[PDB]
């Protein structure tokens with residue numbers, strides 16, 4: 001019995017190009033797929049399937065085993081909607097993340113949809129056709145899998161849910177977020193209870209090192225002003241620049257007094273004593289920045305955007321908003337290499353977007369696509385893949401964070 | 402026989418109902434002879450009035466040719482051919498390699514029963530009052546949309562077994578050709594070939610005989626393939642007196658092709674000949690430097706250089722060097738300066754850049770290239786120092802990473818001709834620019850720029866400042882633009898203005914650039 005699924009009206013299947021892979025990853029992919037084949041989860045396909053979705057091999061944390069990762073991003077987009085988020089979960093002390101992707105492997109996929117799950121294990125130097133497949137069961141990473149498996153999933157959970165009502169359990173794509181406030185020792189032990197309680201039904205690894213997220217401790221990185229002993233013409237100028245910028249957000253910011261210290265083409269290094277008027281204006285400016293701008297609410301119907309700035313020395317900055325300057329959250333991230341770090345960050349920020357809103361944000365990466373497409377899979381560990389576009393971080397925006 | 406591949410017409414569309422052009426009785430007679438045989442052979446079958454579909458046929462001894470454009474327009478999309486070919490360096494050497502010409506393979510492959518009706522055509526009868534014979538295909542029609550895709554597929558299934566049975570032999574399918582290589586002893590190899598030729602026959606797949614087979618070298622699309630080595634087909638340079646934009650464009654083209662094996666080929670001087678050209682037939686007289694490049698390349702080409710094959714056992718080493726501003730040359734080898742392939746890189750990404758940035762991109766291109774050919778990234782040997790790199794690295798807004806690389810002191814070495822101060826300079830004069838400037842020391846200069854553009858004025862201002870300022874300078878500007886440009890510390894640009902500034906910048910001892918609203 002398979003739920004007849006369909007693509008959004010008029011839409012066709014995806015025909016996404018497959019990014020070149022390293023022999024290693026290809027090998028991993030062959031071993032894996034070949035087994036999924038014996039187990040009848042996938043099946044080879046013929047030339048009559050013009051569709052394609054990119055695959056990748058990523059690495060399991062604390063495991064020598066690889067993990068097939070299919071970028072069903074396009075497919076999920078052309079996939080019909082299906083007809084919630086526990087605000088409470090973000091408040092728990094500890095959230096652990098589990099990989100329940102294997103749940104799906106035991107649920108057939110509507111025969112007619114199967115052609116759309118087509119993917120290809122490429123070959124080096126094009127010496128061979130390239131191995132083609134499509135899914136028979138619910139494919140991990142497809143937006144349809146959680147839905148269809150929803151029912152069966154709720155069943156499986158209701159006992160634990162009632163047994164441990166102090167625990168919050170959220171499912172997202174192939175991940176399960178288990179939250180609570182118990183002492184760390186207890187948290188880790190009640191999780192394992194669930195693990196085996198999942199085994200009890202059918203085939204659950206610990207995502208993210210099997211370590212805990214502590215959403216409780218997540219906090220917004222407000223804008224900050226240089227607090228210094230003596231203030232030079234330069235200091236002030238930068239100071240005024242930044243303030244001026246921040247003014248568009250917090251319009252309560254005044255510069256009048258500071259800009260007055262800046263009359264006359266003085267020398268960048270000449271030290272300027274601050275007139276009390278200005279001294280107090282700064283102070284007010286400072287207090288105004290102490291917290292995020294009021295009136296910024298999360299709109300569930302708008303895309304959640306995430307931008308990252310490279311700060312150097314292993315330091316990065318990000319911001320999550322839907323409408324320019326109306327940040328819903330802003331954070332930092334410190335260490336590796338540019339890319340490794342950057343990916344870890346993306347993932348850090350994604351996980352949060354989920355935990356907090358239940359939706360993955362759409363990133364804007366300060367990197368050259370060719371590069372990203374090259375190493376990103378080397379450090380990626382999540383089971384999902386956010387939407388992303390590549391950009392050129394302005395010189396100043398970075399200075400302002 | 403082989404399993405049929407199910408076909409369907411595009412969504413909502415119907416079979417081809419196209420009228421058959423008039424056919425000379427001389428041609429009618431020829432087709433019928435041809436189609437009878439095809440029917441005797443099972444390829445096609447006489448059909449009835451039932452079938453309303455039809456696809457044009459015409460005569461080209463006589464040969465048959467059906468126009469399937471319409472059917473094709475109406476046939477579904479297939480996972481097509483491959484569009485991607487292997488590059489000689491990606492191959493491992495083989496002792497013997499034989500190619501088989503799978504004769505008329507589309508014809509030897511069945512066709513989805515339910516689709517057969519759409520392949521219907523008509524051989525008009527000779528006399529007025531009588532009907533013309535109607536047929537349809539039972540196999541893969543020549544010139545039909547799904548024929549290659551479907552043929553290639555089946556072929557692979559057919560080969561799959563024999564492949565696993567004979568791991569010691571690799572096979573490459575390319576349309577109808579089939580290449581078989583192995584490191585078997587002549588005798589053995591040759592026999593396994595026959596072992597193969599039979600297995601194909603077990604499926605009506607008939608190949609050419611050993612007496613008529615094709616053996617190396619192989620002039621396969623721009624290449625010349627030997628068992629132990631490879632190259633580009635011999636490239637001959639003209640010795641004209643009068644060169645046309647067109648002749649030149651072609652030269653440059655053929656020259657590039659060489660680049661992947663012949664190191665040091667240079668086309669700058671020639672490419673320059675194309676400026677302002679008004680027609681493809683326009684003649685251009687060669688500059689002294691073009692004649693030199695032509696002669697230089699001519700020489701490098703008179704030398705037959707070959708490429709080696711991939712030895713999976715050994716590592717890949719990529720070595721890059723600066724051949725000119727914007728020009729980078731590289732060569733990938735496994736054994737000491739014994740190339741598998743070489744190549745150039747001129748790609749200027751963005752109006753302005755610096756060798757560090759440009760060199761780093763050259764690394765990404767090579768990287769992507771290698772992953773595509775040998776499935777692995779090569780250890781790089783670059784003319785840059787870790788500290789030099791690392792420095793520019795961490796201070797650049799964009800994130801970036803270079804594989805495993807080793808410094809190689811092989812001039813020139815890429816460097817940074819300058820670095821903006823992190824802090825304003827004490828004792829250095831201070832300029833406030835906007836087309837002019839004003840300094841803390843009373844000085845000023847305004848200038849009337851003609852033709853300039855908004856941004857171009859901003860850089861001028863700055864340029865002015867740099868000019869007039871002493872060895873150490875502090876500069877304040879409101880232009881975000883110019884600031885970005887310079888902060889990014891370029892060392893080459895398409896804009897002349899920018900290059901002047903850069904010159905200024907290299908000469909200064911200390912420069913501080915600051916921005917203000």
Ligand SMILES: CC(C)c1c(OC2CCCCC2)c2cc(Cl)ccc2[nH]c1=O
Pocket residue numbers: 127487492493494495498571572573575580581582617618619621626627628629630710
């Ligand atoms: C892919 C395979 C059959 C292969 C060769 O066949 C090639 C395949 C591409 C078409 C032309 C001939 C090949 C040919 C020569 Cl001449 C030397 C080494 C080679 N090593 C190999 O692994």
